[PDB]
Paper text:
[name] belongs to a large group of non-heme-iron–containing Rieske oxygenase family. The oxygenase component has a conserved [2Fe-2S] Rieske center coordinated by two cysteine and two histidine residues and a catalytic mononuclear iron (Fe) center. We observed a head-to-tail α3 trimeric structure for [name], with the Rieske [2Fe-2S] cluster and mononuclear Fe center at opposing regions of the monomer 44 Å apart.
The high-resolution [name] structures cocrystalized with the ligands (carnitine, 2.0 Å; gBB, 1.6 Å) allowed us to define the substrate-binding pockets. The ligands were built into the clear density, which was much better defined for the carnitine structure. The substrate-binding site is formed by a series of β sheets and two α helices coordinating the substrate through hydrophobic/steric interactions involving residues Phe258, Tyr315, and Phe319 and polar interactions with residues Tyr225, Asn270, and Tyr295. A water molecule and a thiocyanate [SCN]- anion occupy the two coordination sites, which are 2.2 and 2.3 Å away from the mononuclear Fe center in [name], respectively. Both the water molecule and [SCN]- are positioned 3.7 Å below the Cα adjacent to the carnitine ammonium group, which is expected to be the site of hydroxylation catalyzed by this enzyme. SCN- bound at the O2 site likely resulted in the stabilization of [name] cocrystalized with the substrates. Despite both substrates (i.e., carnitine and γ-butyrobetaine) possessing carboxylate moieties, these are not coordinated to the mononuclear Fe center as might be expected and that has been observed for group Vb Rieske oxygenase such as proline-bound stachydrine demethylase Stc2 (28). Together, structural, mutagenesis, and structure–activity relationship data therefore suggest that the substrates for [name] are primarily coordinated through a π–cation interaction between Y203 and the trimethylammonium group, which positions the substrate in place above the mononuclear Fe site for oxidative cleavage to occur.
Residue numbers in the entry:
A (entry chain B), B (entry chain A), C (entry chain C): 4 to 239, 256 to 371
Write the structure that this text describes.
């Protein structure tokens, strides 16, 4: 029942953020849950986690426990992680599956393509239906070295969602096929998923909110350019910060020899599960990599987590007029907030 | 407003579990809360806890704090555990009440039958009603050596709910009257009460889910026969497992000299408080009895608690088609799931 | 949405408490939140906390984070604690502000009167509206030596809400202007705000529920007189206990040189934030004052917190008939509950 104009934030030079209800309403969240997150490609992992036959991972997004698994035939598949008998979860965590999936409850077994292998005693069950007792699939695709799922059977391909993105990312970081997961920070953040994207889409805040990092880095004339359902923040010692629709962020810091990736998995209007993954090419970490990981964990990320959490609380106040001015300038400077207008302009298209 | 056919699961040979909404909907739970648990006899304890005058226990079921108390006149009574003046709780925990109940807030005193003994200054309050300032009762009955409460004043008697059950239980365990509480495991379980019953009503899962247990024991016949709102699982050193409507289960393991009892006290659609009681006839326990209690606590029960918790999560998934096939076999073998159909057929009569 | 008669508890000699729904319903709370707490003067502190230029405190009441701040010009002001840019909270805790407020997010600065000082880069933002970018004020007034806020722009003055109260309080304690905060107990209490007022408005409970305190003191005359939206419990070495609409209580114990203040900041139907402040005229504390603080913290207050928490649980029971008799005696004795009737008669006017 809450709608946005089709031209909402179409002019970034004179633009404001959503009326606050869009950050807080459970009704708005339920619509975005089905119109956006059940019908878009959702990045869930780096390819290194699913490279070999029988490799699998599990993810939870908008209330759906999903298993992605590389088959014995090396075909990548994704399934709802729920047994078609009486609903027990099939796999937990991540690792290497055996040659069949065995349900922990009554030990029905499934091939890695989801088809029912053996249902105990089914020969003695009247009219047992073998073809509707398979695991339920969804779409999965490998794109740009990462892995995306899609709950909409009618989805096309990741490239139609993020045209040109793979090429640009492989141009910022040429070592993607050999990156390996070094650390993952798991946090349930009490902020709307769009508030966390807003926080990523500008550098207006890094001076005030990231003193130790911005003070040492003399970064001026850093540009934020929009493309097709993704954007690129590029600064100088190159920096790359990609945002991709709806809410996965890829960062290639100065060395261009490593990456950090932010995965946002919305839970409800005021809760978002975040994975903060750090990837290096070497499995054995040096102490310089170990220290860098702890700087991310204990110094950098807490500052951004605190910001979006305070904003979520303030957004409910009757003392917040309703919308915030997006501080875009004529020059599209490094401190311009125009990236927020691009993101919210796209979001508004789902609120017509 | 979610209704089931009257013939739901009337034919166990071709049957499926409830549509998933019945295990997850708060609307369904509120209906079951009032149509079943406020109008059925609810087992709360073994008789040994209330055998002497002034004995009392407290229970919480469907949001109601209940005090069950044996009066000075040796009459067993049950009351809502709330003062008639301004609503302070009257008793906590379990034990021996003094000869009057004294409310901790304004020290009104009540007799063990619920009557107001003395309300201070009531002589000076205009039109004070001594007889509607008594504790509010509900029905209680001793049946089969156990204690049942009922929130419906128009209820009849436990035998009308469970015809023949006491006669049959006393044949399975001839020493019930001499049982004493040896251990109680209290768990607030994140599963619908009906998922927990499903898990009790079949042995399809014992091989897969209780490996250490199914591996040691060579069971030479196993039958699940239905009766009158209760069922009996009987195996061969006999084993007896009774389920009684709505959700109390009584087990008589091989020795037949001790019992374990499962009490389910539903909290909401996705939460059930469970009591797992172990009763032996001797007050001082042997080292083998202590060992058996720890096997139940740390090996056996966690396996069943984990199953129902995983099922409750999987039942919410859009990848669960909706209903699960009840694996009934022609022979009604030891691993047949037909007990579930009987249970769910009874539940369905409450969703007309 | 069930309404009360205009004469509800108009006759204290024959009166009952609200039907239990008024203490538990979220719908009732939402009405009282907007009709009472967003339209009444809410006491937040003693003036001593805001006496000097740049002093500030923060409070939270009915979901609103408020900052009260004494400006460089020595004018006392209050603001919603939310940045007009993108909603980050502005200040935390209490203390001495710098000469401008700096937002932690993007470092907009505000003078202590709420007006925008500096918005970084605003010179390059098209059509930037500086005078609709100030912090949002609400009304604040110093009254009786304490500080009140009001969320209703059309509010008048505290004296219109509490006629004669300041005049009578300064007769109870003549040194209010020299008091200083000696101790504060902060508790999120799981009780409706009206249950907590009930608990304050009678001494019917002091004998049974405060045993160590009742036997210890000698009371030669104790009266509870009602006025205009406030009441006075007065005893003899005088004692004064003031309740003021809606739920701030001021205590002047026998020595009549110190004060105890209860602030209730409701959160929802079943949750109330309480501040219990103890004020002495000397800042450097004696051992007897220090001992007295601990008796309040660990002996006296826990008894009252436990009473209201148990009452809130009991009010939900179907075994509570619905309303409780207010134990008013014809002689308005020391243990008469007639004060509850006065309070509930005032509350009832909002449920017509
Ligand atoms: C894009 N930018 C620099 C604004 C956000 C940073 O990339 C934060 C991060 O990479 O975790
Ligand atoms: C009936 N059966 C054996 C399947 C369940 C077990 O009795 C559970 C139990 O004894 O606690
Ligand atoms: C009003 N009365 C005496 C009932 C309550 C006490 O004043 C509570 C208090 O002083 O904190
Ligand atoms: S739930 Fe998977 S086999 Fe029964
Ligand atoms: S509440 Fe039990 S006596 Fe007042
Ligand atoms: S939110 Fe306060 S300056 Fe950006
Ligand atoms: Fe940041
Ligand atoms: Fe089991
Ligand atoms: Fe008290």
């Amino acid at each position: 029942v809450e709608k946005l104009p089709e031209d909402f934030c179409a002019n970034p030079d004179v633009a404001w953020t959503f009326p606050k209800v869009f950050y807080t309403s459970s009704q708005v969240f339920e619509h975005e849950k089905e119109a956006i997150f059940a019908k878009s490609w959702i990045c869930v992992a780096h390819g290194s986690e699913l490279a070999q036959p029988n490799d699998y991972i599990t993810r939870k997004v908008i209330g759906e426990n999903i298993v992605i698994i590389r088959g014995k035939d090396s075909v990548l598949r994704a399934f709802y992680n729920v047994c078609p008998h009486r609903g027990h979860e099939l796999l937990s965590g991540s690792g290497k599956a055996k040659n069949v999936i065995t349900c922990p409850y009554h030990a029905w077994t499934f091939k890695l393509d989801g088809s029912l292998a053996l249902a105990r005693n089914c020969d003695h069950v009247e009219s047992f239906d073998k073809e509707n007792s398979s695991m339920v699939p969804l779409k999965v695709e490998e794109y740009a070295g990462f892995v995306f799922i899609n709950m909409d059977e009618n989805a096309t391909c990741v490239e139609d969602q993020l045209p040109g993105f793979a090429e640009r990312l492989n141009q910022a970081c040429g070592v993607i096929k050999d990156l390996k997961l070094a650390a993952r920070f798991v946090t349930e953040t009490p902020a709307n998923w769009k508030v966390i994207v807003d926080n990523y889409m500008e550098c207006y805040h890094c001076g005030p909110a990231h003193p130790g990092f911005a003070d040492s880095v003399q970064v001026d004339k850093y540009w934020h350019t929009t493309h097709q359902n993704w954007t690129l923040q590029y600064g100088f010692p190159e920096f790359h910060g990609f945002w991709t629709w709806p809410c996965t962020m890829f960062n290639v810091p100065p060395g261009s020899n490593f990456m950090t990736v932010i995965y946002e998995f919305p839970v409800d209007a005021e809760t978002t599960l975040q994975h903060y993954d750090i990837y290096f090419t070497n499995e054995e970490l040096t102490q310089d990599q170990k220290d860098l990981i702890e700087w991310y964990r204990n110094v950098f990320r807490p500052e951004d987590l605190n910001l979006v959490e305070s904003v979520q609380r303030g957004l409910k106040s009757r003392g917040y007029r309703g919308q915030g001015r997006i501080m875009t300038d004529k020059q599209r400077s490094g401190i311009s907030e125009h990236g927020i207008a691009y993101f919210q302009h796209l979001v508004a298209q789902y609120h017509q």
